[PDB]
Amino acid sequence: VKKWECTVISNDNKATFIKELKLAIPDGESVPFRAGGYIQIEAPAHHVKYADFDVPEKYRGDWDKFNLFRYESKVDEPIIRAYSMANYPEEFGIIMLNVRIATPPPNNPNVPPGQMSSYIWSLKAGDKCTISGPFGEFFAKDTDAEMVFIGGGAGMAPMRSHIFDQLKRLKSKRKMSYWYGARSKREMFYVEDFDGLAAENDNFVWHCALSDPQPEDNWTGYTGFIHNVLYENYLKDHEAPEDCEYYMCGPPMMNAAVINMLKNLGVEEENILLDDFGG
Ligand SMILES: Cc1cc2nc3c(=O)[nH]c(=O)nc-3n(C[C@H](O)[C@H](O)[C@H](O)COP(=O)(O)OP(=O)(O)OC[C@H]3O[C@@H](n4cnc5c(N)ncnc54)[C@H](O)[C@@H]3O)c2cc1C
Ligand SMILES: [Mg+2]
Ligand code: NA
């Protein structure tokens, strides 16, 4: 296991509650990881204020609505946490992460904010970030079966890594689709990336479903929760959904609803691979 003291290239919001942390590896080297894998970030003792975070006005609505800038996080001893690569292995020299900020639950507002994610959200371009690894178990199976990727929230990271690894490094012709659920259009990201792959690869398609599209979205795409949209628009009519491989990563409510849906279809657990962030 190696450690790298990386430099933060950027740490921009991609969604209301998700930042994309981009890290430059020293000397241009790469972490020798597999898609679906993860690194660990370690943080020293520190103290951060949410009021100091850089959150663009476009994403600030819920932050103001719930007074999330009230929070502070004091960490007296080093801590360490896993985060999944959003880049694939031939995106060299960098580690890209998608980090959800783990705020106090709205029903429990005076408990401490999430320690490591509040630290990551405090990082700005030029800061140093120590990572170690790589690790992993959420690896793609080596078959020719159709793949169905299902993502929500920061689960975008290992899905992006997997899908790019299949199409760019493995040059796979397997049938592949990606279904991503989000609340409204501002919560979407990597749209240029996946639109690009879908235009260039006739074996790949992707869909987004919004559960609460906003008036400003002018949304005419799928609406609702992703397990309903995947079922209604693809799996219901599928001639053999039990023969696909399902790769899923999302928030806990999404994981549970998707897995329940798949099992009611008769998919067996061997064909359902969950990357559980432990929410
Ligand atoms: C293999 C792996 C890969 C992962 N990849 C990703 C990834 O790519 N992106 C990502 O976002 N996450 C990922 N995770 C999850 C991630 O490691 C952290 O668990 C996550 O960031 C939360 O950690 P934290 O330190 O911010 O929050 P913690 O300090 O662990 O707190 C978690 C939550 O509990 C609340 N809390 C604190 N004190 C109390 C109390 N007394 N009572 C009740 N509640 C309390 C906090 O407000 C917070 O919401 C991954 C996890 C694993 C295992
Ligand atoms: Mg966005
Ligand atoms: Na396509």
Q: How far is the CA of 117 from the centre of ligand 1 (A)?
A: 7
How far is residue 151's CA from residue 182's CA, in Å, rounded to a whole number?
9
Q: Which residues, other chains included, contact 241 with Cβ-Cβ below 8 Å and sequence gap of 6+?
A: 235, 262, 265, 266, 267
- The residue contributing the CA closest to ligand 1 atom 33 is 114
Residues 98 and 156: beta-carbon distance below 8 Å: yes
Residues 8 and 22: beta-carbon distance below 8 Å: yes
Within 84-129, residue ranges assigned H as helices are 115-121
Question: 7 pairs with which residues across the strands?
Answer: 24, 128
Closest CA to 134 of 85, 91, 80, 98: 85
Which of 20, 79, 81, 97 maximizes ligand 1 atoms within 8 Å of its Cβ, making it the mutation to test the pocket?
A: 81
CATH homologous superfamily of 1-136 = Translation factors (2.40.30.10)
**Domain boundaries, given as residue ranges, for the chain:** 1-136, 147-265
Residues 178 and 151: beta-carbon distance below 8 Å: yes
Return the percent helix, strand and coil in the chain, to nearest 5: 30, 30, 40
Query: Is-same-fold flag (1-136; 147-265)?
Result: no
Q: How was this structure determined?
A: X-ray
- Helices 191-200 and 156-164, packing angle to 10 deg: 30
Long-range own/partner contacts, residues 68-74 (CB < 8 A, 24 or more apart): 68/103, 71/103, 71/104, 71/113, 71/118, 72/47, 72/48, 72/113, 73/47, 73/48, 73/112, 73/113, 73/114, 73/115, 73/118, 73/119, 74/46, 74/47
- The residue contributing the CA closest to ligand 1 atom 50 is 277
Q: How far is the CA of 219 from the centre of ligand 2 (A)?
A: 14
- The residue contributing the CA closest to ligand 1 atom 6 is 83
How far is residue 279's CA from residue 274's CA, in Å, rounded to a whole number?
13
Ligand 1 touching residue 108 (CB < 6 A): yes
This structure's resolution (Å) is 1.5
Say whether 31 sits in a helix, a strand or coil.
coil
CATH topology (fold) of 147-265: Rossmann fold (3.40.50)
Instruction: Point out the ligand nearest to the CA of residue 185.
Output: 2
